[PDB]
From a paper:
In this work, we have identified, purified and characterized, both biochemically and structurally, two previously uncharacterized mevalonate kinases originating from the extremotolerant tardigrade [name] (Hashimoto et al., 2016; [name]) and the psychrophilic archaeon M. burtonii. As part of this study, the crystal structure of [name] with mevalonate in the active site was determined to 2 Å resolution and the crystal structure of MKbur was determined to 2.2 Å resolution. A loop region between α3 and α4 in [name] is not seen in the X-ray structure, suggesting high mobility of this loop; mobility in this region is also observed in some other MK structures. The N-terminal sections missing from eubacterial and archaeal MKs mostly form the two helices α2 and α3 in [name] and can also be found in rat and human MK. A conserved Arg residue in MKrat (Arg241), corresponding to Arg261 in [name], was found to be essential in binding the tail of ATP and moves inside the active site upon binding the substrates; no equivalent arginine residue can be found in MKbur or MKmaz, where it is replaced by a serine. In [name], Thr119 and Ile215 align with Thr104 and Ile196, respectively, in human MK. The distance between Thr119 (the N-terminus of the α4 helix) and the ribose of the ATP molecule is ∼3 Å in [name], compared with a distance of ∼7 Å to the N-terminus of the α1 helix in MKbur. [name] presents a classic feedback-inhibited profile, as well as inhibition by its own product, while MKbur, similar to many different archaeal MKs, does not appear to be significantly inhibited by FPP or GPP compounds.
Residue numbers in the entry: 1 to 102, 119 to 406
Amino acid sequence: MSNLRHLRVSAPGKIILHGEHAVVYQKTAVALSLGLRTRLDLTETTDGRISIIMDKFLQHTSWSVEELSKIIDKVKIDANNPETELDQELVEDLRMMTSGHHTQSVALVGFLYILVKLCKFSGKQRPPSIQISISSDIAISAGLGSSAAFAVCLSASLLSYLGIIVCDRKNCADVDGKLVPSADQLALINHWAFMVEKIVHGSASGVDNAVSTYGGSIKYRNNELTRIGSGLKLDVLIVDTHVQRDTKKMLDIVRHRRKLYPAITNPVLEAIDGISETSSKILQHGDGLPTGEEYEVIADLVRMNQNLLSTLGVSHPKLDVICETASRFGQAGKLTGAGGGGCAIVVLDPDMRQFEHLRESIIAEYRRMEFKPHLAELGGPGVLFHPVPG
Ligand SMILES: C[C@@](O)(CCO)CC(=O)[O-]
């Protein structure tokens, strides 16, 4: 058969309907996967190098198998307690090693970290000679799960290539010719993706990598997960502010306001938690398109959450304008993700969903204000393995 092994994986982007920022402090979130996907090819090579390239983000970047073997030699793994948190020393070593290149630095660190750690875990003292090529539909500046989808693609591709998971046409199930990893495989994919996400933003909740891994609709709290996609089907318009914002700064804002105003900020986080719980029950127990009644509750939950997020100081004038506009059209808007920029989501009422002209009006308004509207596809699959023609 083939001289050169070749793997292909994809992972979806995401929105958070409820519980961003709160989820960092052990509260509940509700998150949904998108039709926007990150795509990764990994092939065998014979040059004794490891390389990564990513469209519109990273030029060809490589290391010798020799240099990385020396890192693997000095790396430690706990044989008794699975590393739930980062080996900060390796991270700094890797950061030092990659500072010379011309969030692309943390992407490289994240890659090397799980590569080295997965080799150590699997008892390889030397990494295999490989090339990785990545592309995405997900903009980095949008807060739609760019980094998570990248993390998940790396995790699944490396776990499989190094033989730590074996995903066969017997072991795994088929969706439209693609393979879905098993439950156990999904957990392990998710774990190593989480480690990458922690390098990108230290106090990531793990909701992002979890929804990217598993796909569909999830209720998430403190790295524990419930699938809830077998319920109401929402219609959501994504609206990008074109404002780019560091996630870490937004997290810092909330961490600070929590120290400064404990008796305000903490009850606000609890209120968000309650919104997420209520939402999760509405979505779970319903079926089909929301009625007018169900939509009004859903819209109310969205507006309450945007208000509470604004209270945490993580909104932005342009996010505000988007949500205010949503309200003028009878809709309900909130930021999704880190805030301070990025995207809002506008949950659409039953009419706006049936009738194109309604949808087109709101869309044209957001365009007139120089935002990019994009109608979300929801409920799609999580990480997938693909067959490679040729
Ligand atoms: C702001 C936040 O809640 C969502 C990031 O999209 C951070 C996290 O949960 O990792």
